[PDB]
Symmetry: D2
Subunit: 237 residues, 4 copies
């Protein structure tokens, strides 16, 4: 199986598999069942911003999700990611819809990682920033249903021509370049990511959610990972 660490923006409470009973954000380490969650006062139709950060010293993976004009939801979880993830990962966004649906539209996404090893000055680094997405985002690995639309947005899950979300969709976008997040001599590794996202839905209870995730580089959408498993895991273990 893949090895996944993710920050989930989980619209739909699958109490069935451990979600809290409300939309929430969560930090997922090798399981869809979040190690930590926070209630998320999700607002459809309004652009949200997620900022996710980690450094290997603090070993604290944190996420905050906010919309202008509203209180942010924060969740953090202490985890030494280097003991969970391989040295090389890819980073990506995933989203699914299921029986209930929503757009999982990413309007921008940036990411910066640094890997500082003891014997070198400066920290290898990788940064990418998209304030919009091309038609052909050659630097993204689009998995599943993910595509970019006319408007320059990355629709992780299928939307119609007019942008209306489809059910039972799963899509991910990984940044093309593997990211080096640890190494034998590493002193400190960190990464920060932000994305903005627009979740719209005609459903009164939208689903399923959007994640930023980090994975083995050859990560692919697991079989059976649709819907509540957020395109990340093959089961709800």
């Amino acid at each position: 199986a893949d090895t996944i660490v993710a920050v989930e923006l989980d619209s739909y409470p699958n109490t069935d598999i451990g979600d809290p009973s409300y939309p929430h954000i969560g930090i997922d380490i090798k399981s869809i069942r979040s190690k930590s969650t926070a209630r998320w006062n999700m607002q459809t139709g309004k652009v949200g911003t997620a900022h996710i950060s980690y450094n290997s010293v603090a070993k604290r993976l944190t996420a905050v999700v906010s919309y202008s004009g509203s209180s942010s939801t924060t969740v953090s979880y202490d985890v030494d990611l280097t003991n969970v993830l391989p040295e090389w990962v890819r980073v990506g966004l995933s989203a699914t819809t299921g029986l209930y649906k929503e757009t999982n539209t990413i309007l921008s996404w940036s990411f910066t990682s640094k890997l500082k090893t003891n014997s070198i000055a400066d920290a290898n680094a990788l940064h990418f920033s998209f304030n919009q997405f091309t038609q052909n985002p050659k630097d993204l690995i689009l998995q599943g249903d993910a595509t970019t639309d006319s408007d320059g947005n990355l629709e992780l899950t299928k939307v119609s021509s007019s942008g209306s979300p489809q059910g039972s969709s799963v899509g991910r976008a990984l940044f093309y370049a593997p990211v080096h997040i640890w190494e034998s001599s590493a002193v400190v590794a960190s990464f920060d990511a932000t994305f903005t996202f627009l979740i719209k839905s005609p459903d009164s209870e939208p689903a399923d959610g959007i994640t930023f995730f980090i994975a083995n580089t050859d990560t692919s959408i697991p079989s059976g990972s649709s819907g509540r498993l957020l395109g990340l895991f093959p089961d709800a273990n």
Copy 2:
């Protein structure tokens, strides 16, 4: 008094004022008596790197110090800096020598702060000019002909003097919190070369963040690392 948060690289154990009894790195929050420390296996005469990180979501200030080929030392401390520091600060490096001495040479120093929403401030020196107009040099701090920042006095032959204190603040105030940023974060790194003729060098060097008008407190020499007026 100033409001100080610092990561100290404390070479000299003043067990007196609650240092652990070995060189250590520490997170200091409004006191020289670190809120968290970790044994620092110093390597006098070798270039060290320190990296210090915080973000307001994680609320964990951490530092790691390392040398080439060496195991690192880390220390972290849960702290919400927005409850501690004013929203505008200056960041700086400080160092002292005391009865024992050491060079407190900073070879490089970078800092990035973000207040996201995305104000950012980043500087990086891999060398310091003779006249570093973007530093506020306080106390004994100078830059030398190598473009190194000598936080404490060293003789013309690079020999460190005792009873020295010096700091260098970055010139621009840093906006580290604001009533509506969603997250504020900063990271700092510096490389330093502590050499000493002494069996147990002293006293230490720090990266610190302070009220913008921070200045070396009177009495802050030696074990007070140029940061605090007393050991409270």
Copy 3:
């Protein structure tokens, strides 16, 4: 006098002092009489973005100014900043109104300078604090709520006043060049909102780089864009 290099977004032709006869962007080196200009199809009431860059290897200072959905205006001029500016500078935005007027509202401003192979400075404001401690506001410049930098005076409803001059300098000096640097470069962008009820708005705004102690020169009102004491 100060030493000024500037990219001017000059709304108002003062052909008397060598403006071309249309709104134009310009590269000014030590004189309001731009060394190079390009026609600027202003779009009053629309947010514009200006990107200015320079690299000491290319020795070309360039600026482009665009509004969303419209063709950009670009102007470049070969210049060796190290023969023009002191090595330490402050960078800033200036703007003026004179007989005619416009808002010179800066909504965001970022800047990055590097000296390789040594220094970097970067700052970015997506909004400006009510009290931007890291800006030196000169003349009439203020920040409003809405978090904008109003370089020139606007009424409490935001209507621009004439005969205003305002500048904002980033607080830290920037080491814009240095003799042993292999490359010096910098990049700046700002977005601005010029609105005016005048059918011939004026006068303009600039991003400029100056000796660190630069101040609004006397008589630099209006067509002098807050940068120069005369039109030489």
Copy 4:
């Protein structure tokens, strides 16, 4: 064929293909016959640094190669790269040896590209920085003889176990992610690249050279590109 733009550090004068009669740096636009050259006081055995910059408003591609105790050499070329390169490219370093040889060791390599538009927020940025190269650099595409060695260096051309450069070698390393180097509606696109390199040679006249280059994303070492073609071009046209 590939579309190549490169800054060559050309140790070896192939005057038969228009090289000047001395080591030189050059800006190559779709040809090994550089559009502009500058005499390069190559400092064998010393680490050099190259800085390359371009931006589409200035439209000047420039490079400086310096060492810490002689050269600078600078070369620039006015070129609108949106008219030369595809909008998506990979960026890389290449180097070759021929009959004569030299190490083409890269000690560090950084690159930043931006596509800027109507915000202080890039429409896109890509930055990477390697101050050392891992033994399995998953974010590099190593082509030809390029490998990383045990010192953390990227040896673009073959070096023996003793570190002795071999002749007839070509190697390139591309950053893994395509870079959107321009785009129809970007207001400004720019890139900067820096790398440090160490050319050592036991030859009286080391050869052949090393480049930083930008190419179609699917660029490969042209057959017939060894030696004076620097791994970039299929011929000397």
